[PDB]
Amino acid sequence: EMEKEFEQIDKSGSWAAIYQDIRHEASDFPCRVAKLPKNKNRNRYRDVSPFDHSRIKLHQEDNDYINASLIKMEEAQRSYILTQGPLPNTCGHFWEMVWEQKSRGVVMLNRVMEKGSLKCAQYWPQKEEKEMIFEDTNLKLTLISEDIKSYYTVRQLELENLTTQETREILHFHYTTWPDFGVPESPASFLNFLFKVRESGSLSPEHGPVVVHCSAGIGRSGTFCLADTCLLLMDKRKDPSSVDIKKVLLEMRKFRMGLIQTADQLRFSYLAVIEGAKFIMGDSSVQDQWKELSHEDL
Numbered sequence: 001e002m003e004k005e006f007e008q009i010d011k012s013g014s015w016a017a018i019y020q021d022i023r024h025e026a027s028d029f030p031c032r033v034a035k036l037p038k039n040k041n042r043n044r045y046r047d048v049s050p051f052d053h054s055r056i057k058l059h060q061e062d063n064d065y066i067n068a069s070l071i072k073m074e075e076a077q078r079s080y081i082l083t084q085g086p087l088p089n090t091c092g093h094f095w096e097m098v099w100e101q102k103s104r105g106v107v108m109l110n111r112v113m114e115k116g117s118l119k120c121a122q123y124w125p126q127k128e129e130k131e132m133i134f135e136d137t138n139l140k141l142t143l144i145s146e147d148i149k150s151y152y153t154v155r156q157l158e159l160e161n162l163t164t165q166e167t168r169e170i171l172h173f174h175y176t177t178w179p180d181f182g183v184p185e186s187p188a189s190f191l192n193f194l195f196k197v198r199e200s201g202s203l204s205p206e207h208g209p210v211v212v213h214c215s216a217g218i219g220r221s222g223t224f225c226l227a228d229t230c231l232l233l234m235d236k237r238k239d240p241s242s243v244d245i246k247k248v249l250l251e252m253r254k255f256r257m258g259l260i261q262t263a264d265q266l267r268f269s270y271l272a273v274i275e276g277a278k279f280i281m282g283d284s285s286v287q288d289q290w291k292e293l294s295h296e297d298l
Contacts, residue, residue: 001241006270019263022246026253029053039065042093044084048216054255056081058093059100060137066093067217069256070209071225076232079209080225082256084217085110085120092134094123095141098170098211099161105171105202107212109220114180119215124157124172138162144169149296151177151185152193154200173197178220181261183268187275188293190268194228194276195287203228222259226252227272234273235280245270 009015033039034049042065043049049067050056056068067090068083081101085108086094098106112120124141125132131142144156155172175193177185184190197203202210214220226249234243249266252259260266278286 002243002245002270003274006267006274009267015263015267018246019260019266022249022253022260022266025250026257027250028257029254031055031257033065034067036065038063042087042090043067044087045216048084048218048258050256056083056097056101058096060096066090066097068097068211069217071252071255073229073232073251076229076236077205078203078229078232080228081209081211082217082221082225082259083211083213085213085215086123088121091121091123091132092137092139094211095134095139095159096137099137099139099159099168101211102208103170103202103211104168104204104207105173105197105200105210107197107202107210107221107224108172108174108214109178109212109224110180110214111176114215119180120213124155133162150298151175151189151294151296152196154196171200171202173200173202175220178214180215181219181265183223183264184272186293187268187271188290190227190272191276191279192287192290192294192296194224194231194272195279195290198228216258216261218256218258219261219265222249222252222256222261223265223269223272226260226269227276230269230273231276231280234277238281240277240281243273245273 029051031049033052050069054069057064071080110119125143128143133140140160142158144158147154153174157170159170160167212221230243230248234240
C-alpha cells in the first residue's frame with residue numbers, strides 16, 4: 001500500500017535505490033526507425049527515442065517518423081501520446097500528429113527556455129492576429145483565447161486542415177513553473193493543473209489521446225501521466241490499496257523509455273497520487289483546497 005511504502009522508503013532514505021531498481025527492470029525494445037540517418041534531425045536528444053512498436057506514425061508517405069510514443073494503458077482505459085518538445089523543423093509534424101490522432105488537448109510541462117537554453121520550439125501562436133501556417137503539413141493554427149494563471153496558462157487554439165478546410169479546437173495546457181529535472185512546487189499545485197486538464201475533456205475517451213510533452217517527453221511528462229493513470233485506476237475500483245505505483249510505471253515504460261527521470265520525480269509522483277486519493281475517495285472539497293493552495297490567481 002502506497003502510503004506505508006512511502007513512509008518506509010522515506011525513513012530508510014532509499015528513493016535512489018527504488019528508482020534505480022525501476023531503471024534496471026525497465027523494458028528495452030528497439031528504436032530502429034528513430035535511429036535511421038534520415039531521422040537524425042527529427043530527434044531532440046540522442047538518448048531519448050520512441051520504441052518502434054509504440055511510435056506514432058505520421059500519415060504521410062515521405063517520412064512518417066516523429067519522436068512520439070503511444071502509451072496505451074489497458075487496465076486504466078486511457079491513452080497518452082508522449083513526445084519531445086517540437087524542433088524548428090518538426091512543428092508541422094507535431095500538428096499533423098495532433099490532427100491525425102484526433103487529440104483535443106496538448107499538455108506542455110516545460111518552458112521554451114529553461115536554464116538558459118532552448119528546450120522547445122515556439123510551436124503555437126502567441127498573438128491572435130499572428131496565426132501560423134505549417135506549409136509542409138498544410139495546417140493552419142490560430143490562437144483564439146488564453147487564460148493566464150500564476151503558474152499555468154490555458155490556450156484555446158483552432159487547428160485547420162488546409163487541404164479540407166476542416167477545423168478543430170485544440171486546448172493547450174501550459175505548466176510554466178515546473179523545472180527541468182525538477183518537481184512541481186506542491187502536490188496541490190500539480191493536482192489542480194491535472195484536474196483542469198481532466199475537466200476540459202482532453203483526457204476523455206471520445207477524443208484521441210492527449211499529447212503530453214516537456215523537453216524530452218519522459219520526465220515531467222511521465223510524472224503527469226503516471227499520476228493520472230494511478231488516480232484513474234484507484235477511481236475505477238475505489239481501492240487505493242490495489243494501486244502499485246511502481247508496477248504502473250514499469251507498465252508505462254513498456255511504451256516509452258525513461259519515464260520519470262529522477263528519484264525525486266518518483267517521490268513526487270507518490271505524493272501526488274496519495275494526495276489525489278482524497279478526492280477520488282469522496283472528499284470533493286479537497287479540489288477547492290488545491291485551487292486555493294495553488295494561488296493560481298494573478
